[PDB]
Amino acid sequence: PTIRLERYSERHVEGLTALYNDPAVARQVLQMPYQSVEQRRKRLHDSDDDRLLILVALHQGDVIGSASLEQHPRIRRSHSGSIGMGVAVAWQGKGVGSRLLGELLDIADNWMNLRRVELTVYTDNAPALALYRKFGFETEGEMRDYAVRDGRFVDVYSMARLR
Amino acid sequence: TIRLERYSERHVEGLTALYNDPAVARQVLQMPYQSVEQRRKRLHDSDDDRLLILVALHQGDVIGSASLEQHPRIRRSHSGSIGMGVAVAWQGKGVGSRLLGELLDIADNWMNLRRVELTVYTDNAPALALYRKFGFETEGEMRDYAVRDGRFVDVYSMARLRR
Secondary structure, eight states, X not given: OOOEEEEOOGGGHHHHHHHHTSHHHHTTTTOOSSOOHHHHHHHHHTOOOTTEEEEEXXXXXXXXXXXXXXXXXXXXXXXXXXXXXXXXXXXXXXXXXXXXXXXXXXXXXXXXXXXXXXXXXXXXXXXHHHHXXXXXXXXXXXXXEEEEETTEEEEEEEEEEXX | OEEEXXXXXXXXXXXXXXXXXXXXXXXXXXXXXXXXXXXXXHHTTOOOTTEEEEEEEEXXXXXXXXXEEEOSSGGGTTEEEOTTOOEESSXXXXXXXXXXXXXXXXXXXXXXXXXXXXXXXXXXXXXXXXXXXXXXXXXXXXXXXXXXXXXXXXXXXXXXXXO
């Protein structure tokens, strides 16, 4: 399986909207179902800062994953970046999460020269947790009733990777 | 003596002076030498019932400030954040408790928030004592979270739950 990584752009709006519109994908991050292609196309054209990088994983031209890294906008926090709820993959277990996470960390380390990369993950998302720890993330805190998922408040682990 | 009021244009000058005190600015994430200029552009065009900013006044002088912001995302909207917390000129004079107690009244009785979040520097004992007094519990410790006095310092990630 050949996986190209690309900067999320106009030509990807349709596939990415579809990726996060899958209830099984959305519930593991903070997205809501039924998002519009046009509302996302907007937020895209309403984006231009190089401190926010959004990558899409592709197969035969289809968006099968996505991840983002954003350096904090505040000067006293600018040595850190966040990848949010993490990697969003549709094809789990086929190396997409690793391809995306490795590429984002490469940028953080070697190009932005960030000292700290932060993320949050649902405490029961064992597969995601295993991936993040493989890449150097450690749990720093546990946040109770952090977000809504499946009609109830669930916890997330707050993680960080220091360089 | 201490009057609490909604932060508006009338206060931009006093609030700016507040943060220009390095002893105040260093315990939060603000930068010194801010100018009434950029703040006004921020306030006078930035209005949601989600963000509440208060200023503590004594004889018309801004001696303290704090803000509560309900998270914008639907799946996180049951929570709110007060950032690095309470920014006070007079430590020990009861300005912090005044401000915080009032933001929590709004959070509990009007917004009906289930979770309020904050971060505080690990070595700021009086602030930690204040947040603990109001029900906040430490949920995690974040290493090299921000810059303070030319070095990376840690913070405690705290949350106050209402169930």
